[PDB]
Design a protein around this ligand. Structure first.
Ligand SMILES: *[C@@H]1O[C@H](CO)[C@@H](O[C@@H]2O[C@H](CO)[C@@H](O[C@@H]3O[C@H](CO[C@H]4O[C@H](CO)[C@@H](O)[C@H](O)[C@@H]4O)[C@@H](O)[C@H](O[C@H]4O[C@H](CO)[C@@H](O)[C@H](O)[C@@H]4O)[C@@H]3O)[C@H](O)[C@H]2NC(C)=O)[C@H](O)[C@H]1NC(C)=O
Ligand SMILES: *[C@@H]1O[C@H](CO)[C@@H](O[C@@H]2O[C@H](CO)[C@@H](O[C@@H]3O[C@H](CO[C@H]4O[C@H](CO)[C@@H](O)[C@H](O)[C@@H]4O)[C@@H](O)[C@H](O[C@H]4O[C@H](CO)[C@@H](O)[C@H](O)[C@@H]4O)[C@@H]3O)[C@H](O)[C@H]2NC(C)=O)[C@H](O)[C@H]1NC(C)=O
Ligand SMILES: *[C@@H]1O[C@H](CO)[C@@H](O[C@@H]2O[C@H](CO)[C@@H](O[C@@H]3O[C@H](CO)[C@@H](O)[C@H](O)[C@@H]3O)[C@H](O)[C@H]2NC(C)=O)[C@H](O)[C@H]1NC(C)=O
Ligand SMILES: *[C@@H]1O[C@H](CO)[C@@H](O[C@@H]2O[C@H](CO)[C@@H](O[C@@H]3O[C@H](CO)[C@@H](O)[C@H](O)[C@@H]3O)[C@H](O)[C@H]2NC(C)=O)[C@H](O)[C@H]1NC(C)=O
Ligand SMILES: *[C@@H]1O[C@H](CO)[C@@H](O[C@@H]2O[C@H](CO)[C@@H](O)[C@H](O)[C@H]2NC(C)=O)[C@H](O)[C@H]1NC(C)=O
Ligand SMILES: *[C@@H]1O[C@H](CO)[C@@H](O[C@@H]2O[C@H](CO)[C@@H](O)[C@H](O)[C@H]2NC(C)=O)[C@H](O)[C@H]1NC(C)=O
Ligand SMILES: *[C@@H]1O[C@H](CO)[C@@H](O[C@@H]2O[C@H](CO)[C@@H](O)[C@H](O)[C@H]2NC(C)=O)[C@H](O)[C@H]1NC(C)=O
Ligand SMILES: *[C@@H]1O[C@H](CO)[C@@H](O[C@@H]2O[C@H](CO)[C@@H](O)[C@H](O)[C@H]2NC(C)=O)[C@H](O)[C@H]1NC(C)=O
Ligand code: CQB
Ligand code: CQB
Ligand code: NAG
Ligand code: NAG
Ligand code: NAG
Ligand code: NAG
Ligand code: NAG
Ligand code: NAG
Ligand code: CA
Ligand code: CA
Ligand code: CL
Ligand code: CL
Ligand code: ZN
Ligand code: ZN
Ligand code: ZN
Ligand code: ZN
Lengths: 693, 693
């Protein structure tokens, strides 16, 4: 028969392996011919595999590339203006790829051009708290300095924003072996560690959900009216460039001024990690000079969109999407995910050829330009937002299937928690020592929930991937799953480097493609249940549980300031009341969902619609303050780290560093305003689960 | 049996008459005890009539009232500062009401307090073009002047905004007999004309859809965080007061300075209509002084919400709403509408008691504080916006049932045009000379469509009533219908005066209550069809027809400026393309709607959902420029007259007075931006009617 087991058994490790090999032989950088040819290949194969329709959806968006005949580099310059040290113009290519053309050299996408020259300040990870320590405690002024920051802990766009607000005139990003060289493992090609010549590429925008910097709110189609560059969203104002740790050692070794304030500021290089500004006595007249000549240009990108029409509810969409563009070869990011999607489409297509169709429509997407700011998924969602917000059941992301080989990682809406627990109990663990045990069992053992005994950890969705528009803007229930290591936000060692290849995966991460297969079963199994369960597989009671946890957490932050809460009459009573009501109404809804007359398709659908629009109810059409495309009131990407999720973000940001605000009455008024908005939204979401009339 | 005919035949003229008498014996001003008692009466009666549930929904909103012990008035003051003429402190009460307490004296709701003293300028109707004529052609400067403006043509809030932007320090509004005294009819109590002591009350806010000035975006519930008054939405900055034409004659008779520029500036009083500034030679040292002491205060209001649960689709809402608060007795506005609603509820309830239920849920609303800015409907819709945008089929308004006795007036979405034509062909005309003929026949004869032979005129929805939040903010298909006269925006002569009483209606407008009954049959019949037709009674092809008409119209405005359209490459091609596509897709959708398998309730509902969400597709979640609560891209209230609808309002406002903008490149860029937004929205709406997968 045609059930989930049939679907799951058709998935093959050996197919994922062949697809990964096929997708990682040449670079597939967004906006290049190679990436368009791969799009056309995917489209053809998905048609072959049996999808009803497979189309390319193209957009013309702002991208950024280095100048081929005027390379980016950094120097140490002496008082004469002689360049006595230059950083490398490219990463040494890996074995057997030394003749591959069109490897893009390391650069920070969307950097402006410039040639700033100045004294260095070392700013650790360039986090908000690192700049607080520099400016408040150590009294070091970054104005007119070039800052040097180690990659890790937070999204690099936030480091750049923070440097810019500190008055920096340039930023140098580098990979410290503390964060990108695991002890006892060899550098690529002999192991999975970053070599000293390796460099992490990546964009440095602060889009806050906007998509193409030139067309916020609307798709970048053929007749789009663009903003001028000066009004574009999210572009940095200062030049930025990334380097490897051989080059970083040269720049750091001469640094003078103040000592590091403590050991959390020192990486693993043989240097003092002095904060500066500038170099020690002998070299105090030498400066650092950046040379950045990258250009921003409007460039066509292509999404592949495949449809498998639903037999019963064709107007309800379950979406499996992940990106196809890569920085270089994309051996992990994204092709380990894209190969998994390809095999999922192939398996669904096999069932379709035997006469089966899912209950609801499944949409499959191969997104472009994820690396330049989630541009392909965001522009497509802008184009199709009316269809998605009335018809979108769920979005499952499918970027990198592995970032380690230790255990499963899931980040998703609470509405999916039950679905994920149930599915993982039915899947086999691929882990050594758990032969014949469930994935749920191995995952819960290796990654226990901090709250609940006998449960696995499931994280909040943050951002930095293509689910952002669906979840944070549109309020469609979203999830993601991958295999992971034992700081999650820094990336694995060869992240966004030329060394992330097929061989990296086949030799060091997953030689038997068993972790890829397990990830295909989790993502595919989610999609299968979402598109085929009679009653949507969402449990509203799980949202009630987390809302109480988030309410407790935000109340606790505010309670650091008891005198102000008394003075300005700051009460969380309304939020706790709303959460109590949501808990009560959700419990009654769950009873009706179990009890309702199961022969009545209208009651079922009213109730499926209530389930589908529950995530939608958390959207505030006015958005969060100064972030109009982050509309979800429960979750937003952290204002300090795009990758991390923050709960009750409007109240969290109103409280953050509040003791430093010059007008406390106004600052606490805005806290109260955010409490009202949160309480109201929670109550309004609860009421969507009440009896409808 | 229980069909529409059963519903319609139960409606009785004599019941509407009794209800109107019952609702108009005492004032029902928003926020007063009397209006709360009437709310409680309605709630009790609707329960009696048989509704499933009838609740009050209350909010605490900003209202405005005169100071009882410090009355508002205007003087002419001589050079000594003696007040030589004072305007009246109240309207002479009508016969037999001279002992009614709590008649609010004439005032302009939300005026600030002040005592400005200065020279008068007469500004005709204080329209945008009247101020253009004064300032551009006649070179008269209104800065620091008190302006005097006749009521009529545009909403009074726009007159005040225009006066304020001209630098006026106060505004005096008055009713000219040209606009409020029909030739050959007697003044109240002997006919329906305004007496010289009569005065039109009314608010002067510019809310642009926001609702309560203190809580834009969110309901004014018990825990709401309010804006301070200085940040409130839409409050006027200068004092304003209305007067009758006996008093206006005193203020106008002495005016000097320039002559009126032409006869369209002269009303019917025996005065020159000089524009000023100031008085003629002999009186040139006399000034005009206002004394305004009204106060704004947060006050509780109450909506009554009645539910009649649907038998098949209880999660689909058809809403019949109209307001209950009045300025004084509300003989026409709103109780001629509220009596009609009451009789509709009674008729539906009779069918319900015999075992019938509508297919979809019908919600009935008695809104509060409409007169103070659509506050009750808007706050309730803010509270329930998630329910309404996923479940709202249609909204039928029910304010004044009559504003004349000549013919029917309908303003509605194009989606309702077919429904209205079909229903009116089945109703009897109440008109003299059309005995035994259809309402469609009398209406089409008396009010022919300017475009199509053998069709009646149906207007755009503008605003100035409680459908604004449902249509302009939420995108729920909306309509309104009333009996009317042969300028629609000025109001009938006794509008918002103490003279609008039961006797006015019973003696002069509708002695047999036959026009009330016809209006009950149109509004009730609409609600019946919307809540009971298997397939929703919306025809998308009618939207296609009007979109082409609006595209032609906006193109024609732009084509006044051919040189600029060449210079800045301003093309309407994308908008015409979108409209052509909408026309094609709508035609194919209509074929499927006729042809689809009528035994399949899922296809029916997919298709009912496509019909319901079509109006919703015209909403842009980013709103129009500086008007975030006007989100519909096809229709918005005119920026120059809240009562009037404007089509493609984003492009219309970008083009308006464009030849006066100092930076034409920037002005024409914004035209192009609005063309893109309009073309995209039309295409996106079209695509919601495509096959879903
Ligand atoms: C969690 O869910 C509960 C429902 O179980 C909600 O409880 C409501 O809470 C509000 C605000 O606290 C209550 O509001 C109060 O309403 C009183 C009148 O209520 C009656 O009439 C209404 C119709 O208008 C009916 O809906 C209702 O059933 C009652 O019959 C007012 O008199 C109250 O105002 C007075 O007291 C306050 C506070 O002291 C003063 O500020 C006022 O000036 C005034 O004197 C008040 O507005 C409401 O009755 C409750 N509904 C119930 C029990 O059904 C919670 O609101 C909800 N939590 C959230 C966050 O939404
Ligand atoms: C009204 O409805 C029609 C559909 O009937 C829409 O027509 C589309 O119009 C757009 C814009 O004019 C066309 O866009 C063009 O697409 C070409 C590629 O199209 C093929 O591949 C795509 C997948 O990517 C398929 O969807 C499609 O079926 C085709 O097989 C591009 O090559 C074009 O770009 C080139 O020309 C332009 C203009 O000269 C240059 O600016 C570019 O640099 C480039 O050289 C172009 O983008 C699209 O093909 C049409 N779709 C069709 C016919 O199905 C209208 O857009 C719609 N009106 C509105 C307002 O939406
Ligand atoms: C994940 O799996 C669990 C365990 O199977 C699912 O919960 C179970 O769901 C079924 C079907 O709704 C429940 O059965 C019902 O029991 C009541 C009697 O208590 C009866 O009235 C109903 O007719 C029906 O038989 C079962 O109680 C429930 N078990 C629990 C909550 O422990 C859960 O739904 C799954 N999650 C999904 C699909 O998202
Ligand atoms: C207003 O009334 C008109 C006139 O009755 C309605 O249009 C008519 O609608 C019916 C039912 O959809 C159409 O009948 C169909 O005819 C085709 C053959 O042409 C057949 O395939 C179908 O099975 C069905 O019998 C009829 O053609 C149509 N007449 C027109 C358009 O002139 C209209 O729907 C009403 N508007 C509403 C309810 O909003
Ligand atoms: C990746 O796999 C695809 C599909 O098998 C290969 O593309 C095919 O190549 C053959 C031989 O050149 C052609 O006859 C077909 O037209 C291609 N099919 C397509 C594009 O759908 C592709 O060559 C493989 N790439 C690598 C690097 O191995
Ligand atoms: C670093 O690179 C720069 C730029 O290529 C080198 O300086 C140039 O050297 C050439 C040839 O010797 C001169 O003609 C140019 O005038 C120099 N350009 C600039 C901008 O200074 C420099 O030699 C390199 N330094 C090291 C240590 O390799
Ligand atoms: C308007 O009609 C209502 C309903 O008939 C009247 O209210 C009733 O009055 C009687 C006699 O005083 C009471 O016994 C009932 O309790 C009332 N019913 C209600 C409030 O539902 C009301 O008196 C009428 N008003 C006028 C001005 O005629
Ligand atoms: C218009 O009204 C004002 C205010 O009531 C009158 O002026 C007042 O007259 C009283 C009693 O005669 C004096 O004590 C006050 O000093 C006056 N107040 C002000 C503000 O001037 C005035 O008489 C009235 N004018 C007419 C023509 O009736
Ligand atoms: C490795 C993690 C931390 C980040 C990784 N995402 C990612 O690399 O996306 C890109 C683009 C993300 C964005 O612009 O929001 C980036 O972070 O440079 C992921 O989600 O797998
Ligand atoms: C008589 C028409 C022009 C206006 C009338 N509406 C009306 O009186 O509403 C009030 C409040 C309208 C508002 O504040 O938007 C007013 O115009 O002062 C109606 O729609 O029947
Ligand atoms: C890149 O640099 C070259 C040579 O230095 C120059 O001629 C050209 O203007 C630049 N290209 C772009 C795309 O800016
Ligand atoms: C830092 O340096 C700049 C430039 O010299 C100066 O304008 C600014 O006031 C300084 N800021 C602090 C906080 O010391
Ligand atoms: C794969 O698994 C082994 C066993 O724990 C581990 O030591 C090795 O480092 C893993 N590879 C990666 C890339 O994590
Ligand atoms: C109204 O005026 C009276 C008497 O002139 C004054 O005592 C009171 O302050 C005012 N009332 C309000 C509500 O402002
Ligand atoms: C009108 O009068 C004011 C005040 O005297 C003055 O500031 C302003 O410039 C004048 N405006 C015009 C357009 O003449
Ligand atoms: C009622 O109808 C008659 C007949 O045309 C008309 O002359 C009279 O003025 C009407 N009343 C009103 C209030 O329009
Ligand atoms: Ca865009
Ligand atoms: Ca509000
Ligand atoms: Cl992912
Ligand atoms: Cl109306
Ligand atoms: Zn990726
Ligand atoms: Zn990446
Ligand atoms: Zn009214
Ligand atoms: Zn009114």
């Amino acid at each position: 028969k045609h059930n989930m087991k049939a679907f799951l058994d058709e998935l093959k490790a050996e197919n994922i392996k062949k697809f990964l090999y096929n997708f990682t032989q040449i670079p597939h950088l967004a906006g290049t011919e190679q990436n368009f040819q791969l799009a056309k290949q995917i489209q053809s194969q998905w048609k072959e595999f049996g999808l009803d329709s497979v189309e390319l959806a193209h957009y013309d968006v702002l991208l950024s590339y280095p100048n081929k005949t005027h390379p980016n580099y950094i120097s140490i310059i002496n008082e004469d203006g002689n360049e006595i040290f230059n950083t490398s113009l490219f990463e040494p290519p890996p074995p057997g790829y030394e003749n591959v053309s069109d490897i893009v050299p390391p650069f920070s996408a969307f950097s402006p051009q410039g040639m700033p020259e100045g004294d260095l300040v070392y700013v650790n990870y360039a986090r908000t708290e690192d700049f607080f320590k520099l400016e408040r405690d150590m009294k070091i002024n970054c104005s007119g300095k070039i800052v040097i920051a180690r990659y890790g802990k937070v999204f690099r766009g936030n480091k750049v924003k923070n440097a810019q607000l500190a008055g920096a005139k340039g930023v140098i990003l580098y990979s410290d072996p503390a964060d990108y060289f695991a002890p006892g493992v060899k550098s690529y090609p002999d192991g999975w560690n970053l070599p000293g010549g390796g460099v992490q590429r990546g964009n440095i925008l602060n889009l806050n959900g906007a998509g193409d910097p030139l067309t916020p709110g609307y798709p970048a189609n053929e007749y789009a009216y663009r903003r001028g560059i000066a009004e574009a969203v999210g572009l940095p104002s200062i030049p930025v460039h990334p380097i490897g740790y051989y080059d970083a050692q040269k720049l750091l070794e001469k640094m003078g001024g103040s000592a590091p304030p403590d050991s959390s500021w020192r990486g693993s290089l043989k240097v003092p990690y002095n904060v500066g500004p500038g170099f020690t006595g002998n070299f105090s007249t030498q400066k650092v000079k950046m040379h950045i000549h990258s250009t921003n240009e409007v460039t066509r990108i292509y999404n592949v969109i495949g449809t498998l029409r639903g037999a019963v509810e064709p107007d309800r969409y379950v979406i499996l999407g992940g990106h196809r563009d890569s920085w270089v070869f994309g051996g992990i990011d994204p092709q380990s995910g894209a190969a998994v999607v390809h095999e999922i489409v192939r398996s669904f297509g096999t069932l379709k050829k035997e006469g089966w169709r899912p209950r609801r429509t499944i949409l499959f997407a191969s997104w472009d330009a994820e690396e330049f700011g989630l541009l392909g998924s965001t522009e497509w969602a802008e184009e199709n937002s009316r269809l998605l917000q009335e018809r979108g059941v769920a979005y499952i992301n499918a970027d990198s299937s592995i970032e380690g080989n230790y255990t499963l990682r899931v980040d998703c809406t609470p509405l999916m928690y039950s679905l994920v627990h149930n599915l993982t109990k039915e899947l086999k663990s691929p882990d050594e020592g758990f032969e014949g045990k469930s994935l749920y069992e191995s995952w819960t053992k290796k990654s226990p929930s901090p709250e609940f005994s006998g449960m696995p950890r499931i994280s909040k969705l943050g951002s930095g991937n293509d689910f952002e528009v669906f979840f944070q803007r549109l309020g469609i229930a979203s999830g993601r799953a991958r295999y992971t290591k034992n700081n999650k936000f820094s990336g694995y060692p060869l992240y966004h480097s030329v060394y992330e290849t097929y061989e990296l995966v086949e030799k060091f991460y997953d030689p038997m493609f068993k972790y890829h297969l397990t990830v295909a079963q989790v993502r595919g199994g989610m999609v299968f249940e979402l598109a085929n369960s009679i009653v949507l597989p969402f449990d509203c009671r799980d949202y009630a549980v987390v809302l109480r946890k988030y309410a407790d957490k935000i109340y606790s932050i505010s309670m650091k300031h008891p005198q102000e809460m008394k003075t300005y009459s700051v009460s969380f009573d309304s939020l706790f009341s709303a959460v109590k009501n949501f808990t009560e109404i959700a419990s009654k809804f769950s009873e009706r969902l179990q009890d309702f007359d199961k022969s009545n398709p209208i009651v079922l659908r009213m109730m499926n619609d209530q389930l589908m629009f529950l995530e939608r109810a958390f959207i505030d059409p006015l958005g969060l303050p100064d972030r109009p495309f982050y509309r979800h009131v429960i979750y937003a990407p952290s204002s300090h780290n795009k990758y991390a999720g923050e709960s009750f973000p409007g109240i969290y940001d109103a409280l953050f560093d509040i003791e430093s605000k010059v007008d406390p009455s106004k600052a606490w008024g805005e806290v109260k305003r955010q409490i009202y908005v949160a309480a109201f939204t929670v109550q309004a979401a609860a009421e969507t689960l009440s009896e409808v009339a």
